[PDB]
Homo-oligomer: A and B are copies of this chain.
Amino acid sequence: NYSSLNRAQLTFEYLHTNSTTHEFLFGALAELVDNARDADATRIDIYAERREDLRGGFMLCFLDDGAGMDPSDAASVIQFGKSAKRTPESTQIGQYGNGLKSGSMRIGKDFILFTKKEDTMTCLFLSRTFHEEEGIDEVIVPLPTWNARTREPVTDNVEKFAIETELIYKYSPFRTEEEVMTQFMKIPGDSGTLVIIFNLKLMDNGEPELDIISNPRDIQMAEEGTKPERRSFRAYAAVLYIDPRMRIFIHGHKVQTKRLSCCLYKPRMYKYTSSRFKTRAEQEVKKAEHVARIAEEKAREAESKARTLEVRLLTRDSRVMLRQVQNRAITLRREADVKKRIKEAKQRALKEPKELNFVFGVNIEHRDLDGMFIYNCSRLIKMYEKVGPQLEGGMACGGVVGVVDVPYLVLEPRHNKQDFADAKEYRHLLRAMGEHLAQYWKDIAIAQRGIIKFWDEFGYLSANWNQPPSSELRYKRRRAMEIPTTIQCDLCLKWRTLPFQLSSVEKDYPDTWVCSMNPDPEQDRCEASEQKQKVPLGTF
């Protein structure tokens, strides 16, 4: 019994410490978007709610229709490091048990979260304002739960519930039970979550870091020196995931999420055999083989004992002791059989090709927006990273975008999910990408016809590399014929391609598009199987 011993504890100032991991502010917002994706949301709405009485003048709200949280899931939010996602073979992005807390506290002083699942609804309130006003150095978190149908309190301690809710009514943006219930009503389905960050951080000039006024369909950094994804959250959100499904809306307006590899001229894929991937997968199998073997030894020991003890023995004493070893044998056999299945699954996975897929294509719409985009378990970590020939002063590989998805066995992310924890191996990957890039440039052979004429044809008349291509009617169409338009159905979440349509070059597409708007007979119903847009194979 260790109950008397000292525990490590969190103090109030740690919330700030933790938040300093995010220099890139959009990386803090990404943590909340990641959590919605991980909860299987089909949509997330990121929107502002004007509140002149709160610091920065609005609250930033993240509303998803994912799985939500029951009361124990909600309580675990404040167990720093706790993540039910951290399982071997995770394709969830979350693994460190920190993102919501590091991200929210970078963005604002306070947050309040509402979540609904099955028959309960829970509020989690993290108020640094309360802590400062009352001189609290611990981290104290109100966590009231109500019945989702009756709205009655669900609590073991009515005095605690009254203190919890009064703290919410005193310090949060919602000053009555009725105002709180209005927030729970914004989660219209059976389940979902609403995170509201408020008292937003200010710049020196007293204005918020986030500008939602300049473009009321966007969230921008309040300050072109910058790539679009570093100043426009609409741009960043579109490419945050390599395989988007979840729809994203900003201030009610759909984000045109995209697969970068489908937005490029003449995409090509190269398989890179990864010695780390294979080495590490082998070591994982060996660990699981060991674990399974030891569990089998222990089960066989207990099974032997049950056999031998039974023959040796009927008093009630001997009956109870025989059953105790018989049940122990049964328990250990079931555990040994579970470890065996884990090991066998890992053995099967080991035989899959241990390769990374590099995809390259030319960004003819914005040739200055080039370099490598490096994803980790499908989540964007690094963008616009120049490699190989791009590191020289040349036109060689100018305009080429590269994409790769790196599994957790090959690389894990830093604390802020904007870098890689193993710099040596990351640099090795960049070197390999650079070599394959050079091969790509040979394989499309622009030198054959020239580069001065290639770019001229898509409307790049200026000698200013970073100037946009011509806007005229012939050049827009010429670029449009090379990159098929793809679009996601708002109903079924399938991705579809649209045949070129000269009447469609003039416009873009509304907040809604559905499969039955498609003119291709082969993909005009939600029922038509999703066609995988496939990338020709190159060799290095």
The one of B10, B82, B141 in contact with A13, judged by C-beta atoms closer than 8 angstroms, is B82
Q: List 17 A-B contacts (CB under 8 A).
A: A5-B142, A5-B164, A6-B78, A6-B140, A6-B142, A6-B143, A7-B10, A7-B139, A8-B138, A13-B81, A14-B81, A16-B96, A17-B98, A21-B416, A23-B414, A223-B424, A415-B415
The reply on A513 being an interface residue by CB < 8 A is: no
Known: A11-B81, A14-B97, A423-B23. A4 touches B157 (CB 8 A): yes
B10 contacts A280, C-beta separation under 8 Å: no
* Residues of chain B contacted by A413 (CB below 8 angstroms): 20
Inter-chain contacts of A133 with B (CB < 8 A): none
Chain B residue numbers with a CB within 8 Å of A414 are 20-21, 23
Q: A236 to nearest B CB, angstroms?
A: 15
Given contact pairs A9-B78, A12-B81, A2 touches B136 in the complex (Cβ within 8 A): yes
Do the beta carbons of B415 and A81 come within 8 Å of each other?
A: no
Query: Is A422 at the interface (CB under 8 A from chain B)?
Result: yes
Name the B residues within 8 Å of A81 (CB-CB): 10-17
> Which partner residue on chain B sits nearest A157 by CB separation?
B4
Q: Which residue of B lies closest to A142 (CB)?
A: B5
In the bound complex, do residue A14 and residue B421 qualify as a contact, i.e. CB atoms below 8 Å apart? no
Given A7-B141, A8-B141, A17-B80, 11 new contacts (CB under 8 A):
A6-B143, A7-B138, A8-B78, A11-B79, A13-B82, A16-B81, A16-B96, A17-B97, A21-B21, A21-B416, A204-B280
| Neighbour of A421 across the interface among B23, B141, B279, B393, CB < 8 A | B23
The CA of A79 and the CA of B159, in the complex, are separated in Å by 29
Q: Which of A13, A97, A159, A276 has the most CB of B within 10 A?
A: A13
Contact A5 B96 (CB under 8 A): no
Specify which chain B residues have a CB less than 8 angstroms from the CB of A6 in the assembled complex: 75, 78, 140-143
Contacts of A157 in B (CB 8 A): 4
Q: Which residues of B contact A442 (CB under 8 A)?
A: none
Would you call B13 and A86 a contact (CB within 8 A)? yes
Q: In which size bucket is the chain A interface? A: 35 or more
Q: Which of chain B's residues have a CB closer than 8 A to the CB of A345?
A: none
A139 touches B276 (CB 8 A): no
The answer to whether residues A83 and B5 also contact, given A23-B420, A420-B23, A423-B24 and a CB cut-off of 8 A, is no
Q: Is A163 an interface residue (CB 8 A)?
A: yes
| In the bound complex, CA of A164 to CA of B3 (Å) | 11
For A12, A81, A96, which residue has the most chain B Cβ atoms within 10 angstroms? A81
Is A18 part of the contact surface with B, judged by Cβ < 8 Å?
Answer: yes
CA distance A23 to B81 in the complex (A): 19
Is A382 interfacial (CB 8 A cutoff)?
no
Q: What mask results when residues 180 to 211 of chain A are scored 1 for a CB within 8 Å of chain B, else 0?
A: 00000000000000000000000010000000
Q: Which residues of B contact A4 (CB under 8 A)?
A: 157, 159-160, 163
Q: A13-B82, A23-B419, A143-B6 are in contact. Are A204 and B276 (CB under 8 A)?
A: yes
Docked complex Cα distance between A360 and B23 (Å)? 28
A20-B96 contact given A10-B10, A157-B4, A204-B279, CB 8 Å threshold: yes
How many Å lie between the Cα of A223 and that of B424 in the bound state? 8
Q: Is A34 an interface residue (CB 8 A)?
A: no
Residue A412 lies at the interface, judged by CB distance under 8 Å to chain B: yes
Smallest CB-CB separation from A141: which chain B residue? B6
Q: Which residues of B contact A8 (CB under 8 A)?
A: 10, 78-80, 101, 138-141
Q: Given the complex of chains A and B, what is the CA–CA distance between A80 and B7 in angstroms?
A: 11
Distance between A101 CB and nearest chain B CB, rounded to angstroms:
8
**Partner among B139, B204, B415 whose Cβ is within 8 Å of the Cβ of A17:** B415
Query: Shortest 9 CB-CB distances between A and B: which pairs?
Result: A14-B81, A8-B139, A11-B81, A13-B81, A8-B78, A17-B96, A4-B160, A21-B415, A20-B415
Known: A10-B80, A419-B23. A163 touches B98 (CB 8 A): no
